[PDB]
Structures are given as C-alpha cells and as structure tokens.
Amino acid sequence: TKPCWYWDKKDLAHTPSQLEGLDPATEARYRREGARFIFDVGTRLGLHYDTLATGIIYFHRFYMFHSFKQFPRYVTGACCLFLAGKVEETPKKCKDIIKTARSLLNDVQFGQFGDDPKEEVMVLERILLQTIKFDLQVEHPYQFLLKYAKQLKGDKNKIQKLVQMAWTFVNDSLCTTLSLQWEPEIIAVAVMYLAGRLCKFEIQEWTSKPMYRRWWEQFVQDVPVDVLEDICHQILDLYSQGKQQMPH
Amino acid sequence: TESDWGKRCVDKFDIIGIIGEGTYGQVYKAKDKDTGELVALKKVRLDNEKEGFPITAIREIKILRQLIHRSVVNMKEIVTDKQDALDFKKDKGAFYLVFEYMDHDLMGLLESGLVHFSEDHIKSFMKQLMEGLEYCHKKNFLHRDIKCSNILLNNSGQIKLADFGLARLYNSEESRPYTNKVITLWYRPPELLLGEERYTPAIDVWSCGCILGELFTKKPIFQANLELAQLELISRLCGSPCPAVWPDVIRLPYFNTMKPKKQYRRRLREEFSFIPSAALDLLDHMLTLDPSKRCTAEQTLQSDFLKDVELSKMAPPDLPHWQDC
Amino acid sequence: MSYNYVVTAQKPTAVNGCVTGHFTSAEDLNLLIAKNTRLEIYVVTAEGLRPVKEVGMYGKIAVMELFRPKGESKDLLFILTAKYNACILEYKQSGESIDIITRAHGNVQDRIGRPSETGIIGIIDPECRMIGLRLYDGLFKVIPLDRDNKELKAFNIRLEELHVIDVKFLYGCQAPTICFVYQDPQGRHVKTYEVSLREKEFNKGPWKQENVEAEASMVIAVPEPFGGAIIIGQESITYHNGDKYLAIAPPIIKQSTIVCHNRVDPNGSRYLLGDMEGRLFMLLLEKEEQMDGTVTLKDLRVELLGETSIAECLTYLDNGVVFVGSRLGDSQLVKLNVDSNEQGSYVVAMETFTNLGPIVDMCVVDLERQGQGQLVTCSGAFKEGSLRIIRNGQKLHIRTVPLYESPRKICYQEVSQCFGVLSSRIEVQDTSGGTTALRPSASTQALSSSVSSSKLFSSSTAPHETSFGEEVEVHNLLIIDQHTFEVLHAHQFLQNEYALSLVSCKLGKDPNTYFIVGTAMVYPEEAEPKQGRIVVFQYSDGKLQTVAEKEVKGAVYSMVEFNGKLLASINSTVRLYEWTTEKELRTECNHYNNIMALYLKTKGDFILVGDLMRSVLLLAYKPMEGNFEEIARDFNPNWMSAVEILDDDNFLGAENAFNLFVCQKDSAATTDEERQHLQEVGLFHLGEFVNVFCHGSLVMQNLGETSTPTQGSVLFGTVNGMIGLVTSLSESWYNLLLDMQNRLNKVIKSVGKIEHSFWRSFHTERKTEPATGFIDGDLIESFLDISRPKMQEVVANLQYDDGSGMKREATADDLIKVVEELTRIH
Ligand SMILES: C[C@H](C(=O)Nc1nc2ccccc2[nH]1)N1Cc2ccccc2C1=O
What we know:
It is classed as ligase. The entry lists the keywords kinase, cyclin, ubiquitin, degrader. The structure holds 3 protein chains of 3 kinds. By secondary structure, chain A is mainly α. Chain A folds into 2 domains: 1-137, Cyclin-like (Cyclin A, domain 1); 138-248, Cyclin A, domain 1 (Orthogonal Bundle). Chain A is built from 12 helices and no strands. In chain A, α4 (73-87) packs across α7 (117-131). In chain B, α3 (119-138) runs antiparallel to α5 (202-217) and α5 runs antiparallel to α8. In chain B, the strands form 3 sheets. Chain B has a 5-stranded antiparallel sheet with strand order 1-2-3-5-4, with helices on one face. Chain B has a 3-stranded antiparallel sheet with strand order 6-8-9. Chain B has 2 domains: 10-100, Phosphorylase Kinase, domain 1, CATH 3.30.200; 104-303, Transferase(Phosphotransferase) domain 1 (Transferase(Phosphotransferase), domain 1), CATH 1.10.510.10. Chain B contains 9 helices and 10 strands. Chain B is an alpha+beta fold. Chain C has 3 domains: 4-353, YVTN repeat-like/Quinoprotein amine dehydrogenase (Methylamine Dehydrogenase, Chain H), CATH 2.130.10; 359-728, YVTN repeat-like/Quinoprotein amine dehydrogenase (Methylamine Dehydrogenase, Chain H, 7 Propeller), CATH 2.130.10; 731-823, DNA polymerase, domain 1, CATH 1.10.150. Chain C has 7 helices and 62 strands. In chain C, the strands form 15 sheets. In chain C, strands 35, 36, 37, 38, 39 and 40 form a 6-stranded mixed sheet that branches. In chain C, α3 packs across α6 (788-795). In chain C, 45% of the residues are buried. Chains in contact: A-B, B-C. Chain B binds chain C through residues 16-21, 25-26, 29, 107-114, 213, 216-221, 223, 233, 236-237, 271-274, 320-322, 324-325, and chain C through 110-115, 136-139, 158-159, 162, 500, 522, 526-529, 555, 557, 591-594, 596, 598, 612-614, 630, 633, 635, 637-639, 656-657, 672-673, 676-677, 764-767. Ligand RVH sits between chains B (19-20, 27, 29, 40, 73, 99, 101-102, 104-105, 108, 152, 162) and C (614, 633, 635).
C-alpha cells in the first residue's frame, strides 16, 4: 500500500555509510552539510519552504539506502532539490541549481560534480526515484505547526512567539535524522512543547480543554512525553554543540 | 513488498497492443503474467532528458497514489524496462505506470454513435463522475483537463477519471498564479477564455456540464477552433459575459478585448427544452457564466437529478455488439 | 500527403422516394423518382414514362414533396438534403433548353438538437401555408411559405412528445393541424395539434387522443369528404376523426409488415398498401351518405391484389399503371386489372427497371479470358436476392441471376469453373415444430444438396424456445456454374449457424482447392456470439465434401488466404492457421488488441484490420519469429463498413457515416511513436455506404497501356447500388485537378445552390472537416458537359506544374482531351 519511512535511532548504527567505516559523527556532519546545502541553494533560488524540506527528506531517506563514500552528498542534494522542485510545483532548471551550487561551494567541494555537473545530477534522478520507491508526496511539520496553532486562543503575541520559535526548531530539525524517526505531526508537537518550556508558557490554557495538562493529546493521539523529550533533547543538543544559544 | 515501486520489471507483462498515444509516451494494453489481470501501461521516457523525468508524469504519480476512489483510475505500480545496463549513466530504460485497464472511453463510444444512452444511464454516469470529482475537489486538487477522451468506462458500467497530467492543488486562502489555458477548447470554461489565471475548481464543473449536455445530444455543445469563436458560441447559449450576471467580469484581461457579436440573452433552457426537467436544471446550474455562482460538485450530487440515483443497481452501458456487423 | 481520385462507374439505382404531380407543366403528370443524390423527372404516358430531365444534387435527398401555392400555375418542388440543405425548385423550359430554378434555399441545421430515431420527416400543409420538418426529438420546425422567405428562415415549436413515429398535416381543418403517432412509456398514441404562424406555438388540436397499436408505423391523412386520419400497424388499421373510430384487423396483414402507402382516388376512397414480402393490397373506404347529406366513413376493407417487388415507395400514376419503387429489388411498372387472372392475381408486370440493390459483396473475374474482367455482385435481399453480372460495352451490360433468397458472400474458384456463394433464406416456425420456407429459392432448388452433420455444438444443455410464426434464417453455401449460373449444389449449415465469411484457395502443400466458410452460432439471447466454425469443403464431381472443421469460440467475421496459411478474425481475436499434412487447421499465432475484427485485407506479410469502432490497424506477420507485430494504428474513432489496401503505405477505409478516408504510415520514423501512428491524409464524403472494396477494373484492356495519369484500380459497391472506383494520382496531377475543381465550382450552377465544398466535407454528427486528398472525379468529368463560354472561363490563368514545362498555360481544348482520357478508366 504505502512504504514505511521510519527507523529506530538504534538502527542508524547500521546505515551503509556506517558499515563502510564512516563513524557516527562524520555521517551526522555529512547529513547536516548536505541538508544545509539543499536549504542554502534553494533559498538563494527563492524556493518555498516545503520545496526545501521535500528535497531534504529525499536526501535523508537516500542515505538510508546508500553510502556517503559512493554517492557524493552535494551531488545528491542538488538532485534531491531538483526533483523536489517538480514534486512541489516550484520547478527549477537543472543548470540554474548548478550555477547556484557553484556560487556557494568552493572548488574542492564542486569537484564532486566532476567534469560535467549537470550530467552527474540528472543521471542520479533514476537512482533517486527508485530509492524513494516513487513515494513523492511528503508532509512536513510546518503544516501541523500552523493547523494546531490556529486552534490556540489567547494572547496574540505569546502564541506568535511560540509559533516563530517552533518554526525555527523545525528548520533546525531538517539537519537531523528526526525526519527519519518521527512522523511530522509529532515533530510539530515536539517543537511546540519545546518552545513552551523555553518561553515558560502553559499551552493547555490556550486549548479548548484548559484543564487537560497533556495538551498535545488532542492534536496527536498516543504520543508519550518520552518521545517529545527525546526529540527536544536532540534539537537542543544541536544548539549545545554549536555556539548559537536557544533562540528565545 | 507491494510498496517497493520502480524495481519490478516490465517482463512481468505480456504486451497486447497500443491502446493510445500519451504526452510522455505511448500507452499499451498488457496482461500480467502472474495474475492474468489486464492492465494499461504508460511509457515514461526520460531519455530525452531535456528536463529529466516529465513533470506531467510526476503529477500523475503524486496525485493518483494519494487519491483512491471508485471513480478515479487506480495506478497499481511502476515498473522499469530492464536492469541490464548495470551503470546508471548507461541506463536509459523507460519507466511504465501501471493502471487498471478500461474497456472503452466516452468519446469513442459517442463518436462511433453505436451507443444510445438512456436517462437512467446518464444518471448512473454523471453521479459517478461528480462523486469522483467531489473526492478530488474535497482533497483540494483540480483536474484542469476534463474531456470525453479522459472519461473511461468499462463494460460493467463503472466510470473512472484518468488523465491527471495537468492536475494541481488549489488554495482558496492563498491566491496563486496559474496557467492561462488548461482545458481543451471545447470544454474550456469562459473565465479561462478571458484569462482568469486564478481559477477556482468550478472550471471542472463547466466541463462536466458540457459533457452532460453532450450525453443528451450525442454532439459536443461548443465546438470551435479559436478562443473567440468559442466565447461566441457559449454567449449564444449562456448569454454574453457582462457585469449584470458576472460582477467581476470587468477584472479579466480580455473582457474588453473579447466581446461577442452581441450582448446575447440566455437561451439555454430554450435550446435544451427536450431534456428532462431534473436534468435541465442541473445543466443550467453547471453552465453558469460566473464561476462564483456556478454550482459545486457536491451541489450537483444533492440535486433532484442525481440525489436519488442508487448506484447499487447500475444500468450497464448498451455497447451493442451484434447486427452492427 | 496522399493523392487519390474517386469516380462513379454506375449511378445509384435504388429508388429512395417517388412523388407524382404537375411539376414540368401545369398540364403534364410527372413522376419524380429520387435515387441517392439523383432526381429523375418523367412524364406519364399511356404506355409508360417519358424521361425529360435528370439532375444531380450535392446532397442525399431526404425529403421530396410537390406543392402548388396560390398564384403559381404549376407545382413547385421542395427538397431537403440529409445535411439539412433546404431549397424550393422550379422547372423552366425555353424551347429545347431545360433548366432547374433555385427559387429559395438555406440550411436549417440547429446548433443544438438530438437527431430523431425515425429520421427526418417533411410534410407540407394542404393550403401550402408552411413546411413542417421533424429533425430533432422534442422539436417541430416550421418554414412558413411566404413570398418573402427566399432564405427559408424558420422557427422551432417546443414539442412535449419527444419520441414521434410519424406526422402528417390533416385535411379539412379550420387551422393548419398536425396528426402524429408518438411513443412514451405507456404505449403509442395518436394526437393532434394546431400550428399558429402568428403566435409561433401549438394550440389544442381538433380532436382527443386515442391509444393506438404498439407498433403503429404510418399516418395517412385522408382528404374530404372524409377528413381525419388512418393509422397503419402490424396487425390493425384504424380510422380516427373526432368522435368517429373504426378498426379492421384482417389476419392477412399480420403476416408481413406494411411499409408504404399511396392514395389511388383523390377523394380518399381507395389506398394502396405494400408489405415486406412484396404483397400489394387495396385499402377501401366504404362511404355512407346520411339523411343530412353528410358523407361519413362506414367501414374499411382490405383486399389482396398481388405481388410486386419489395417496395420502398408506391405511386399510382394513371389508369392501372402503378410504379413500384424498390430499394431492395428491381423497380417496376405494373398494371392493376379489374378482373383477376387464372392464378387469382390482379397485378401484371409491365416493365422492370434494373436496380443493383444492396451490393453485399462482389468479385471481379475474367470469365471469357478477355483481359477485361466482369463484376459479379451479390445484390438484393429476400425474394429479390440475385447475382448480377456486369461488363462494359456506351453503357454497362448487366445479366440478372435470380436467387429469391438473400446473398451474403461471393468468391470465385477457377479450378472448378464455378462460384461459391453464401446465402440465407427466411423460414417460419410452423406447427410441426420445424420451419417452412415462404417460397422456393436457390438453396432449395439446387441440383444436389447436403446438410452439415457436425457434432461440435451438439452438447446442447441450452434452452432455445420457439414460438409458432417467428422467423429464422437458414444459411447455405451455393455452388453456381460460371457459364449457366445453375445452382449445382447447396449445402445447408447448422440450425442457428450464420455463414459470415468465404474464401476459395489452396493451403500449405495440399494441391486441392477448397471452399472455406467461417460461421457463427447465433442465439437471440446472446448479445455477442460465443461459438463458431471454420469449415473446409471440397467441391469435386458435383458433390461438396466436408474436409475438415475447426471449432472457434466466437464469430468468424472475416477470413483471407495468407501465403498458404489461413488468416481469420474470431470476435476480438485475429488468428493465423496453418494447414497440416493431416488436413487439419493448426493455430500458429494470435493478436488480441481489437474490439471486433470485422474486416481483413492483406498484402505480402502485412495485414490491415478494420474494427467496429477503433478504425484501422496495420499488422505484420514476422516469419523469423512466427507471430504478429503491430506496425501502426489509426487513433481517430471511426465505425468501419469496408477497408482496402491501396499500396504498401496507403490504406483506404469507409465509414458508416457515408465517408471515405485514407491513412498512411508516417514513413519518417524519428521516434517509434511516429511510426506507430497512422495519419489520416485523405477525407471525402462519398454519400454512399460502401460494403465491399475490390481490386480490379471493368475496362477492356488487353496488351494495351495508355499510361493513364491514374494509377491503380479499386472498385466498390454501395447499399444504393452505386458502383465507384478509387485510383491514385501523382502530386502534379492532383494539384492540376484540384485547382480545376475550385475553378469549376465557381462556374457550375448547383441545384439548390449547394456549395460543392460543403457537400464533400467529411461529416459525422460530431466532426465536420473539409475534404482533403481526393479529387471528385464526377466534378472533373462534368467539364466536358459545360458550355464553351464556361470552359474558357475555367481555363483562364490556369498553370501546370512539375511537367516537361514547369509553368504551362491551359486552353479549353487541352483540358477536353485530358478529361476524355480520365473518362476511359471506367
Ligand atoms: C479504451 C481503451 C484504452 O485505451 N483504455 C485505457 N484504460 C486506461 C487506464 C489507465 C490509463 C490509460 C488507459 N487507457 N482503448 C482505446 C483504444 C483506441 C484504439 C485502439 C485500442 C484502444 C483501447 O483498447
């Protein structure tokens, strides 16, 4: 019917990249760099946030089936973004993605595209489509962040602060394998939960059930705090590794 | 599993014939070697590689795997030509989109003229189409190319909509730029002739209304070659676009440009007086000039003509097969 | 692109309609006979008919009626074509010069409308105030006959009764009144309306509805003194007029459906009726004058007069002469006598007018070894069935071979100096449980005879209930000698077995020449047949021997010899059979991508398939692999009547809408898709229904070649009896002839002022396209008949191309020689 696109954290110890001798830290770096490359290229081209995320999700899924040593990340990222453009109806010409990729990448990095950048990318489309098993439709945390925020009623300014902080967390989560661990609905809740703790807001008060302390259960059924905490920990670990502090 | 598309080979299908020509490749009828069920195979060619995998196929793969309705064609799987190349650049093999085969198409049945459709058949036919369009319109997709050639019918009497090559998601809240001409001229709504660019789902309703009339006459209603001649034919029947009936006609790029010969009065009920009352009212509502006054797919289902139509016992199409020889 | 030429070899012979009146002069009695696109004008004499004028029209004549409005000296003629071209015509003669005047004209087609089941009906008011047209369901169109309506402008009146069977204007009414029979779920009814030109609407009609017979077919308007109407059915004849109601149900008419009616006595006392078995009846109106002096209708009587041809139209003319206009058989002039002859008949045939009738099949054979070729056609239906032998000699010589049963297929077997012919005859379920034939015919009058004893379907376990009086077809293979045309042998197929296809050929390494017949088991319950046979016969020593039979799971619509193998179409499937050394058929390969594989033609290893709705497909046999491959398909939907292969790249087809088209291979295979597409490069509205395409020519050419510009020769038969010919041109010759047509059309005056370009445009209800790739040879050959001033006007500024001289001016004398050469291909 539909393919299964979620793995357990423990399973990431056995990606092709890991088994070819790449250590966990390096694959994480390669993922952040490849996701951020997709993000930066598409932002320069003026692409919708969904288009950037779809490319990134294709990218993250791809390296569950292939090794970073055999498929260069920057080529894959460009290919993903190219395909994402067509899937989400924000199309771009491959030559234009290459142009932008060259502007942003140094010469060593751009060496992955080889002697003919456009060709290396277009050829990978067959492998990409087969790898993602032709499941092109993707849902992202953004739509749920907004669907759920619309049902909150209260201080216009405290909620808008919650949404913008959470939206930032979603953008950061694209650099991680959370896209591969939890459905987008859970990600949207987790980022709302995270922002709430950081802003010291008590979200249940804004819901139709103000005495239901587990406010998220009305948006997403069957989600333990265990999960929302695991997700929060991962996002905050990115901020504790990098210099940048929580946005607040 | 059944979800791993793009890996099974086309060796699994015995090819029977060339059923049709498509935009991204030609369509073939085939038989599944393992199950015997007859399928339809659309050949997607990425070898031209002007822009890689065709977007029209991507739309059809993205939308039809999301939409499951009795009246919308089922894409069963995608298969590859052959994995022999062994190198990605060397491989030029095409991909095939598998669909359930349909015995006939609406245009083919009418064009031969062998088939005469009773009111009860038309009720069964139109209820299925509008129920399917309701499913798509509720899921916020627009067909944008509804013609008789794209309405498939099997000998059982089930109707399915098929060509989603131009289908795109519609948002009412966010106004988005769109294509200026999408539907085939004969079935194109008047706003798109005047170049709305922000079209509503009521574009598909107008097409289905053109079909509703056609099923009662066996001849298309608005047959023209040029966009102006078409607006003239629509105007002779529905009345000329004017603010009196379409307050926002003035906001359209070609309203002042594409004036019809006269400011015609509406005669739709006169020229179609031979149609049953319940049906004629449906035609009048579907063929309304102002898309914001044109009925919705749901509203058609809640009509005297289609509401009480029980699809449990549907009349099969009388596609004759003896004495024609 | 492709370039082809189409001419008529034999004009339509079927009588579509006939009317009598005073058209050429207020004094003469004229008989106007309508054949498809042809109007013949005769003047009635004491011996027969004196021909005076014949015209062609650029249209199929649908309605033909003669009327005389107040102020005119003589009758005028109204004609409506099947493409809805209307006109009013006048006969004018200046000494020796006869011409036809177009007094009014226009096209009455509606943008929106559903064409009626019972076809176009046209009637005219007794006071000639208006013309009534029934073109579409639910609408009645009125053309008012005012002096100013030179364009025949008209309006539509909404008609509540959607399904109308027949309508007539009534006599004796205060206002124009229509009487009609209509059908709704409750049955059939008769109803009246009044027609108001002032209000442009119907008003309540002079008399109430009556419920009429379920199969009420025709409406007869009866003149004063009676007034009112007569309604003809399958079992009963009824008279209606207000309160008066009569019904006669004589058992004699129940036997055969009555199809035509004519008035003998202008006062309505006597009427003529004809039925599908050829019987001619007299319907009598018995009068009674009351004490008040009012003339009422006392009773109705039906008397059998005799037998004529199965008549489409009847016209009484004068004295005892009656014209039997037939579409299924020869037309006739017959005399009605007051005294019966010794057989009990009052009808005696005077003259017989040859009608090739329905041409179901035909073949070209050189019987006399002359290099010429003669055409043997399967012509007629039912008791009119006949073979016709046609040879050129300036007129065509036609010999008629009566069969008195329907001929279906014909094929020539030279080895046996005979023809094989498939035929079917009508028998009726009788009280024995079996059936009885209504008359003896070819299959019963054979010298020797046989009946299939096949056990293939003898599995039965199938209910097929029989009621007394129901009709059945009985199908036969007839062996007919090529010199005497005596029926040497008749083989009867199984009960409910319909013979559909016939070939004569050798197969494999078998030196014997066989007759092979493809059949289908037809049961009324079955929508599409599911059983069938291919049967191999050998005609040897005056006896037909069953050699082998192959059971198939469908109907064998078409077969053809294919390089020593047998190619056969079984329902959807197209199959190739081999002939083994054990004298049995063995399947080699199959093709299944068809709806119904009705027609097959071959050339080399290439096969052309014609489908019920999917137009034409080019299929190739691949000998290296032992199977078929699809070369190219026409994706435009067409309902086929016949196909033919012109050359390795061009394919000719005929449509059920009286249209011709030519498909070609793209021949520029940049992509596979382009080659797999067959582009329609020629479009032409013939106006006739083509049953059979046949390669050959009737022209007497032995050891002589004049290198006519035309290359190739395909003959074709039509339902109306027209025999035509299709041939190919070079690009240069087409352009010349096409440019000349455009010049001729500006010069030649059309009857009814019908544009020639409109007439030949490809036309289906849904599509109307301009003709392309075809030269109307009948237009080209008319150059020789136009006056000299017109000839020179045509050739002004006319240039030739791709010739010895690139640009070369034409004179009138140059074209006369060219056209004369073009008239020599038939
Ligand atoms: C109706 C049938 C067809 O194309 N069905 C179909 N089911 C489909 C299901 C999914 C997608 C496309 C499909 N197309 N046709 C039309 C035709 C024309 C000429 C020759 C053969 C045929 C033939 O088989």
